[PDB]
Amino acid sequence: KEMPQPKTFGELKNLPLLNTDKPVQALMKIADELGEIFKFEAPGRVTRYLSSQRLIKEACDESRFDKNLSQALKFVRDFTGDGLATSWTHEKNWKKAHNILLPSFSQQAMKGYHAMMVDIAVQLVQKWERLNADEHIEVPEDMTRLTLDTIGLCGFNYRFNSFYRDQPHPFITSMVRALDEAMNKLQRAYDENKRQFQEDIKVMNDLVDKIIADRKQSDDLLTHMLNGKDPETGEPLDDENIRYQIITFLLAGHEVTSGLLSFALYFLVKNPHVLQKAAEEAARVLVDPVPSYKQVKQLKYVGMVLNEALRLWPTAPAFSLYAKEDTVLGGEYPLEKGDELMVLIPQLHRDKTIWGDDVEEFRPERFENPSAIPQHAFKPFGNGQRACIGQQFALHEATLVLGMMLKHFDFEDHTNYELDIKETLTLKPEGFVVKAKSKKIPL
Amino acid sequence: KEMPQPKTFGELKNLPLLNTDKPVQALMKIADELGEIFKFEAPGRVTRYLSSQRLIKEACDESRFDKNLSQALKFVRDFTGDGLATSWTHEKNWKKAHNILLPSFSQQAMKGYHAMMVDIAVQLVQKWERLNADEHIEVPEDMTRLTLDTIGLCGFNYRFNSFYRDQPHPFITSMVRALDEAMNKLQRYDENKRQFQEDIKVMNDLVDKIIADRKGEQSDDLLTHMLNGKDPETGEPLDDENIRYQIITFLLAGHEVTSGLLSFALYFLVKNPHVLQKAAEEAARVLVDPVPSYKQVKQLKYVGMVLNEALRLWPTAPAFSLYAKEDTVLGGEYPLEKGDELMVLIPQLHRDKTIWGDDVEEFRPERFENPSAIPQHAFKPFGNGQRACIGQQFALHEATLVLGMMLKHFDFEDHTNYELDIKETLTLKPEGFVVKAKSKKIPL
Ligand code: HEM
Ligand code: HEM
Ligand SMILES: Cc1ccc(N)cc1
Ligand SMILES: Cc1ccc(N)cc1
């Protein structure tokens, strides 16, 4: 009933523990020492980090706990506003935008996005086939090039043309720089850093607002938002909220999904039996020069490989909840109304009582049957009505792209890459490089 | 444009296709061959059977289509009359009864019915823990005993005492024989009519007296809400004749339709042990008191998911009927004239691979984690619109309460490795489904 807590630093309490370049991984080390739950204090803030399925399955009770904006999300809200991802459930724009946007992220809506996703994926395939001998691939960089172009085309019919560029796009320069300024505030004479954030917000907001003005009919999210009306209230999304969704989708769509692709490829080159087994599935299912939507649904082992990458290194590694009323967590940790919880997703996915002893081994076979996994044991996309609305978009693009990659190339970990996880607000394997040898199969 | 139609039998057209003991299941085999729509003609009748969400989402447009009394409901109407379920939308007693009765079927109204539901549920649990070793359970029979007793107590404070009987109640004996005669007329005798009239007189005689007997006790029951309720629209209360028709309507809906859901739910749980263990863990973690509370019953989310996925595969009221208010075009390719009839084959709707993926036949309750993700009009086990099931919250509450206690108190064993056999009356039931229950010996 007494809750553990890591080392303290006087009046700063636990905050210097976050003054590190890899905070989620440092939080994982504490959870290994302190167990399924521990209190984390800071000046003016208190939260509790959960790491066991036993406690997280109760925190996932939507009747008792609701999504809370973590300190990181409060700072991202300064440029994503009340978009879907940084709004409170009780805000009117959340439920409104949620009802308008759900049809355009469904599994049936992916049949329309499929043609645009293949468009970007073929550019990735042709880049790797046009590499010279002994040239290598910078994996997370190309994966971000792909995920960023896919959301721009399917989201607003815009071409970032990331495969024609060495330097990133002007818009994402301020977006990435705003995210860095957002994260740095958590672990913190800072007037220049603050003035720059304001300048960067003006750049994003002005650029996106013009895209809305230019459009004001194509089968993309921007059209669905300009013409859709919420069946509940009968009102459409206003223009200010629309750019908040566009900024939210552009941020979410580019690096958290590229992270999954990079982790997936890394685990496949470190476990050649699994890669071989997934390459065989790609060859027997992708029988056309261009994959179809129906073939992508048939790449089941590719789907399990992605799920097993999400288990070990979920690229959105945590989310925050608050207690709607006074309650008791697990019959031994009483909580007051408003108290905050943090679901440390990478520790949850290592609970030995759920996954057995081989928690660190990459075996996509764990996901053969979705019914054998206990409830709330696998939460890479968040939870409940506040779960990821882009989940089916992300898994379809990742399965399609990974399938073409395994079909067209043999892969080689020529540097014996030692996993180094860079942490922003998402997770990525930094410096992960491979060589791709063509299989000389036409497109 | 040209609509497919099945095999014909001369001048009888397609009617001998329904001369079978499993007509809905036979219609599903036809829908698999002919696709999303097909025409079904009989002597003096034509209807069209819809099976895809694409077409059913247009048939559920209340401004174009209204509820129609199918041939099955017309024969039920001979003893349920203009009750809520067998009246036309434009009949004055529907909108009148619908406004008086909706308050007594709301989610806030289940807080009053909960105490009586637990009363019957405890009797089911105690029957099963009092079984001897190697004794088995007859699932749909016991589920029927509970659902009939729950609606009798919550509807009119009457105890059918079904757990003290081997032979069914005298009232339901005549009702069940009336439903059998109603169904037999569809695939079709002077002797049947005499008993049918005798059977109809028995139902009117018990209920007319039960209404006459109630009149001044005030109880938290439908009968009280019907004797004192006034329609805010017209300002009138329901008269005696309509009241007995609702009671018969509720008694028929309460006993067989809801117990089918429980029996199908348990059959799917014993065939998918991973789901049952997952539902048993939730039941053990939520039902912490010897008697469940109303709020603990709202917390068994996965049990609710188990019921919903049971309703998807085998919706126990497997069809409803619509007619075109005016001339319109269905799906852009099928022209329809005002008055044309449609039939929604719910089991085929719930198997549309374009909505549920390929694994439509698999029992995965995880489809219902987020109810907003499923497209519009894709899941219609309780009908559609203002003519949708008024007892939906009442059925799910009882079924969630009862399934929760069963998963809490017993382990279940499919000792005969039961091959599913679906008996068809007007509703669906797994016939002969049996299980053994080993107690977990938790007190009540
Ligand atoms: C593999 C890639 C992805 C992962 C692991 C992921 C993960 C997550 C997680 C964990 C949350 C909940 C965070 C919280 O509870 O505060 C979330 C929410 C959200 N994600 Fe994703 N996401 C991915 C891709 C995407 C994509 C491609 C989009 C769309 C472009 C997207 C858009 C959103 C939105 C809008 C929300 C908030 C929805 C709401 O609150 O109603 N995500 N995601
Ligand atoms: C899981 C169990 C149940 C299922 C699957 C179910 C299904 C349905 C369906 C499909 C309809 C519409 C039929 C049509 O369009 O002709 C309906 C209507 C109706 N149900 Fe249920 N039902 C269930 C339980 C109950 C219960 C327990 C009651 C109350 C005792 C009830 C009372 C009614 C009534 C009165 C109507 C007609 C309402 C109107 O037209 O205004 N049902 N139900
Ligand atoms: C917190 C968060 C992380 C990733 C995504 N896509 C959405 C939200
Ligand atoms: C037609 C009909 C179907 C189900 C119920 N409960 C009542 C009537």
From Swiss-Prot, chain A:
- From which lineage does this chain's organism come? Bacteria, Bacillati, Bacillota, Bacilli, Bacillales
Region of interest (Cytochrome P450), ranges: 1-443
Marked site, Important for catalytic activity, at: 256
Stated family: In the N-terminal section; belongs to the cytochrome P450 family.
Organism of provenance: Priestia megaterium (strain ATCC 14581 / DSM 32 / CCUG 1817 / JCM 2506 / NBRC 15308 / NCIMB 9376 / NCTC 10342 / NRRL B-14308 / VKM B-512 / Ford 19)
Q: Explain what the record says happens when changing residue 72 to G.
A: Higher activity in the hydroxylation of highly branched fatty acids
Question: Entire protein: which part is shown?
Answer: 4 to 456 of 1049
Localization:
Cytoplasm
| Effect upon mutating residue 389 to P | 10-fold increase in binding affinity for lauric acid
Biotechnological exploitation:
This protein is a target of protein engineering. Its selectivity-directing and activity-enhancing mutations have been extensively studied and the designed mutations allow this enzyme to act on non-native substrates and/or in order to enhance production of synthetically desirable end-products.
Binding, heme? 388
Residues annotated for (9Z)-hexadecenoate binding in this entry: 49
Q: What is this protein called?
A: Bifunctional cytochrome P450/NADPH--P450 reductase
Q: What is the effect of changing residue 249 to E?
A: Ineffective covalent modification of the heme macrocycle. Substantially slower FMN to heme electron transfer for the arachidonate-bound enzyme. Product distribution biased towards omega-3
What role is this protein assigned? Functions as a fatty acid monooxygenase. Catalyzes hydroxylation of fatty acids at omega-1, omega-2 and omega-3 positions. Shows activity toward medium and long-chain fatty acids, with optimum chain lengths of 12, 14 and 16 carbons (lauric, myristic, and palmitic acids). Able to metabolize some of these primary metabolites to secondary and tertiary products. Marginal activity towards short chain lengths of 8-10 carbons. Hydroxylates highly branched fatty acids, which play an essential role in membrane fluidity regulation.
Q: What induces it?
A: By pentobarbital. Expression is negatively regulated by repressor bm3R1 at the transcriptional level.
